Amino acid sequence: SITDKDHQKVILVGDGAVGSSYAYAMVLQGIAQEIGIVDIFKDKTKGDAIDLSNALPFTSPKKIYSAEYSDAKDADLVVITAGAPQTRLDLVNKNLKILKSIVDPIVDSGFNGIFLVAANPVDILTYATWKLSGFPKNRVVGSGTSLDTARFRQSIAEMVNVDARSVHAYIMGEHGDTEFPVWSHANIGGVTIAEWVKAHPEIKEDKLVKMFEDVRDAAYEIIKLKGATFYGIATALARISKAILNDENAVLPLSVYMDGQYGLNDIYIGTPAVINRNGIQNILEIPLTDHEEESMQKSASQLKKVLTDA
Amino acid sequence: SITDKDHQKVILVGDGAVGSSYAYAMVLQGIAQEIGIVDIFKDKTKGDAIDLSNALPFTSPKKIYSAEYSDAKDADLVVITAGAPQTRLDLVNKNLKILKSIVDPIVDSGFNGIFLVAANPVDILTYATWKLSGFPKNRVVGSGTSLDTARFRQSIAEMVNVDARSVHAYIMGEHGDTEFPVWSHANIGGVTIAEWVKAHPEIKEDKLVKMFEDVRDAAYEIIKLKGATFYGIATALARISKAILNDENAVLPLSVYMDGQYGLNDIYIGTPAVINRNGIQNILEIPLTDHEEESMQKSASQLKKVLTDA
Amino acid sequence: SITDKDHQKVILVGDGAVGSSYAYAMVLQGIAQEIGIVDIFKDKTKGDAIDLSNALPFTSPKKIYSAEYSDAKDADLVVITAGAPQKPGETRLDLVNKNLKILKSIVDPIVDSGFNGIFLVAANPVDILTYATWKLSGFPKNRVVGSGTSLDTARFRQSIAEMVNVDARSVHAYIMGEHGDTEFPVWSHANIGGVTIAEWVKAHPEIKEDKLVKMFEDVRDAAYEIIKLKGATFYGIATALARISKAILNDENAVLPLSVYMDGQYGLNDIYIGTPAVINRNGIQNILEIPLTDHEEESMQKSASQLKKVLTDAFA
Amino acid sequence: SITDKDHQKVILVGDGAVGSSYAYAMVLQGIAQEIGIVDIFKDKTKGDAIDLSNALPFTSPKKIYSAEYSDAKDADLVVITAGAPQKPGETRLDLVNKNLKILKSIVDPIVDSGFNGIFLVAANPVDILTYATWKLSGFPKNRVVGSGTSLDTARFRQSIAEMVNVDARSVHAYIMGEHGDTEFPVWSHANIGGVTIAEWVKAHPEIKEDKLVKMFEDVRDAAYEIIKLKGATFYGIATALARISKAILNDENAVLPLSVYMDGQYGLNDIYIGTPAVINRNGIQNILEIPLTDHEEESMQKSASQLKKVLTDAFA
Numbered sequence A, B: 001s002i003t004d005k006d007h008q009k010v011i012l013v014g015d016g017a018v019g020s021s022y023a024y025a026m027v028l029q030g031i032a033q034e035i036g037i038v039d040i041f042k043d044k045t046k047g048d049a050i051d052l053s054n055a056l057p058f059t060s061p062k063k064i065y066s067a068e069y070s071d072a073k074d075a076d077l078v079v080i081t082a083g084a085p086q087t088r089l090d091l092v093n094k095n096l097k098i099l100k101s102i103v104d105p106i107v108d109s110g111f112n113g114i115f116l117v118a119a120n121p122v123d124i125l126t127y128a129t130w131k132l133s134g135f136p137k138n139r140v141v142g143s144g145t146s147l148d149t150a151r152f153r154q155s156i157a158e159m160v161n162v163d164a165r166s167v168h169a170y171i172m173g174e175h176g177d178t179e180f181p182v183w184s185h186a187n188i189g190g191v192t193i194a195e196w197v198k199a200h201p202e203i204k205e206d207k208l209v210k211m212f213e214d215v216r217d218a219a220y221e222i223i224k225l226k227g228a229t230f231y232g233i234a235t236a237l238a239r240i241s242k243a244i245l246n247d248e249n250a251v252l253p254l255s256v257y258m259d260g261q262y263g264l265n266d267i268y269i270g271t272p273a274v275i276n277r278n279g280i281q282n283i284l285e286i287p288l289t290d291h292e293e294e295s296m297q298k299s300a301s302q303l304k305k306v307l308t309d310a
Numbered sequence C, D: 001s002i003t004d005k006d007h008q009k010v011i012l013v014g015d016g017a018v019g020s021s022y023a024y025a026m027v028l029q030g031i032a033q034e035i036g037i038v039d040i041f042k043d044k045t046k047g048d049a050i051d052l053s054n055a056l057p058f059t060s061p062k063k064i065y066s067a068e069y070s071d072a073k074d075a076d077l078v079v080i081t082a083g084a085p086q087k088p089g090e091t092r093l094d095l096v097n098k099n100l101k102i103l104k105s106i107v108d109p110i111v112d113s114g115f116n117g118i119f120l121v122a123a124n125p126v127d128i129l130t131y132a133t134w135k136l137s138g139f140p141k142n143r144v145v146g147s148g149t150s151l152d153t154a155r156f157r158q159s160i161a162e163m164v165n166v167d168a169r170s171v172h173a174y175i176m177g178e179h180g181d182t183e184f185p186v187w188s189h190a191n192i193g194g195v196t197i198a199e200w201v202k203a204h205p206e207i208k209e210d211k212l213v214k215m216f217e218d219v220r221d222a223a224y225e226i227i228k229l230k231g232a233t234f235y236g237i238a239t240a241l242a243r244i245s246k247a248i249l250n251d252e253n254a255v256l257p258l259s260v261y262m263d264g265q266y267g268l269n270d271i272y273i274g275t276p277a278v279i280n281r282n283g284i285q286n287i288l289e290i291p292l293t294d295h296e297e298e299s300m301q302k303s304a305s306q307l308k309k310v311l312t313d314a315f316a
């Protein structure tokens, strides 16, 4: 029967706060029917699989378990959250040894699905994942600025008192210090922020600048206050997972392979893209202001120098 | 890529009030990613496909269209609602000529999924569908008493003022005049109706009898009041569709093939069963009282005489 | 207890294909906890209440019943759906007057019940009967709401979505004006993931200007096409009504295209007309004034002008 | 406007792994519209409010913030989570007394705020602190609710589900008593699609009586196992709390196993203990008295008796 393939399977690599939260999000929202959890700490994963399974009588069912790389053989989706924290080039090299020890055995399993990469530094490790896996460009995807974008929208939403789902604004570039806001195209119900400020002059230019600074530095603030950041990215990863598994052709800001867009080549970087069951379908090229295009070039340039050196 | 198969496709046969409502239910609940609508009246289906597509910006996306039997080639699910209304043997023979004109071209398409049958008379046309299609027993499924059961639960729920999802009661047998309630196992939060009546003697025995009579005759009442019945069965069909497509192993009352259960053989009849992506996994055999087992035998016997004659 | 108020109640007026389908949408999505159905045809509503109730064991619970205007006393929401349709003899003014007699016979008893909630109007012609509902009810402007161009907007987005092969939730485009023949598309602000249709066409010159014009014409005329093919249109508006209902009942501050009262916006006054607006538990919070091109602003002025002449003539 | 009340507000007390996870569950499932987070550690709550807010553009909106007891004034729901844990030196009575000082310092200011909603208690030891919360708050019995054996019950169902390979939503089995070492399974009424486990074992004699005993032991001891493997347990109870929260806020009349006040049921009095009960916007509506076997009724009596001795000793 053809319907024997109506069983969706995710392998999660990394059972820290991000991965564990991701899994919980998938459980509550009933996305996928199987989650295998892989981590160096086998006892932690066993415990989490049980704790997560305890939730299932209140949601749709799932097979959940402590897993091994070899369980990726027939998986739809491999989600990588296992990122060693911090020179930048040292950080990269350290995470490359670890990433290779994950990707190689996964490929050897026979895995033939989509890689979703969230480990920091995400754009770089997305490129590294593509390079190591030998998979096509469109089937290796990074979370990129999906979270920064969410943070940006929520910030705007709170300022104007509107549901964030009605706010449309991007953060683009390499996720990190060099990312930038696309104010030229940011809007609320089609009314741009430039037009919004006209109609509501209480909103000072300097508020908007600070708003983006707060977004860019949001991880530092959250870590300072509570030790770690995880609910945002977990929620984003589940959103991306759903777009793939329900074949949505949704537009999301993701780390995607650059083949000419924005005058860039041979890096993964953050931009809006269309995604479905087969991964990336279209890379959307927002036409940026000169100011904005300069930010993109700088972000890309610095990123590319590090990859080449790496 | 393996994820190229994360696209779920339903072909609906019959675009009357039942089928149209089913489709709407699937749209709102975001179940499946494609619905092809097939009916003799091509203009009606074209119109419905458009009207249903107009809803999609408020839900998850779907490809929806007026379709042909040949579009079942790669479908997960074929839902048959096309039932000519009313001797009983005449009714059957009439619906068999029509059913054959549907099933044969669907099989010829290469369809290799699950048949879900709702056309009346459902248990008989479920058997006929199995016989005509040549598919395995567990991949031809009828809606059976899923709707009668829902009606029963809601009736009880209203009487005791409790959420129907907390009421557990079955109607079994052949869907129609000979179906019967399983009071022996019916309960609310594990407290049986027999035990409930003990604790709440306001509930008269004669109320319960009438309650089941009202259930058995519910279609006649609804038709008399508003011309047709459709929201219940559409909702049930969508529930069954979800159990299959999300591989739930849910327990539902369905028309399933009898291989010894209740001392019955070689008919489709209504009983609780476990269902998932591969259709029927287990037929549950409720142990009935003598009174209840007699009702099952009679229901089955009459049904079997009609099939044999047919 | 304060939580005694955590029970949401909708009174639906009109149990035709729109109202019935609305109710079904509310049932499946679990939106309020009580739906009373009111219509001249009491048997129909009794039958629908039962048929809808049959769905409840698969969804969250609800009290559903055939209802009377007096049941609006403590309702959150009154949804009005069944406009008397235009007969081939009649003028637009005739259609309005006919529907005003009927509308009054609904709104007055509802107000007399003590109802103190929000009116959601979908009956055609919607912008006019939204105004009439405000005028008859005496309620505040922001607590009388029409569905306006929410459906036309959905149709527009889905059309674009299909052309570019993208999830319509990722397409952001409005139809504005009076819902009907004089409505118009806001191409200047329409976009897909922030890339405008003007910018999209630059990158994809296969997309001919004429395709876009026709695409909007097909949207404007969509009801005629659907009615011709299957007799009636209902799934789109029912779904929209349920979406608006959810924005109110879950206090969302969602931006939707709705028929809202005009107090200067677009250089218009004292009509209800279609534009994006922010809506929550208290009804309309902000009317968004999209800054239009000259061409687009002209369409809005014409739509408004014709609408206003009819209202003025109607109430005299 | 009456719809000004269509804004649901939860105050969470305790921002440990349970409370935080609860809040996240409420966010993802779109349950109330406002969550105020209260904890001795103000920086933690500020950070969580932000981190949770980051999720909102993917879900329905919510106002989320670091909060104070006085923010309970107009709350629907107060959820209490962070019991001070038992130190290796201390008696059960010591644990209770310690948690009573703390609980009082929470409940009194909440009551003083004007809060007039429902208390949902999850702090361990839950049945006792549910009673203490009732006693301290002065609220009615049916508006103070503990999570009781809702989680143990979930664990039990999932265990059975896994053994028989069936969706746990199709498994109907309770754990009852005081949540903890003295709780017990109700095999007599446990079933899968109406077929009892006694009847299931008849049809499937592979299933050994000893497997079932161990299955319950594993459930009873599940917290110890999970804590041993990963340090803490939280996803199960958070999910349960969100389920109970939804039953209240959507006025469901759902049947759940909860810690409820005993007024004769099972021949018990004046304790909170775990049994199925019907719950809606006004809290507890019916306590369901499952008729137990002699063996099962004995377990309930023992569980209750030990619990009652501790409460009596505690309040003197």
Ligand SMILES: O=P(O)(O)OC[C@H]1O[C@](O)(COP(=O)(O)O)[C@@H](O)[C@@H]1O
Residues within 6 Å of the ligand: A165, A166, A167, A168, A169, A188, A189, A190, A251, A252, C168, C169, C170, C171, C172, C173, C192, C193, C194, C255, D057
């Ligand atoms: O993906 P984008 O460009 O931000 O748009 C996503 C959002 O669009 C929406 O459809 C609403 O936006 P608009 O209503 O202005 O079109 C939501 O469904 C969704 O959360």
Ligand SMILES: O=P(O)(O)OC[C@H]1O[C@](O)(COP(=O)(O)O)[C@@H](O)[C@@H]1O
Residues within 6 Å of the ligand: B165, B166, B167, B168, B169, B188, B189, B190, B251, B252, C057, D168, D169, D170, D171, D172, D173, D192, D193, D194, D255
């Ligand atoms: O399929 P059955 O036998 O009626 O049970 C289905 C129902 O069981 C439930 O889990 C609740 O029933 P209980 O809470 O008594 O176990 C619901 O999730 C679901 O609607």
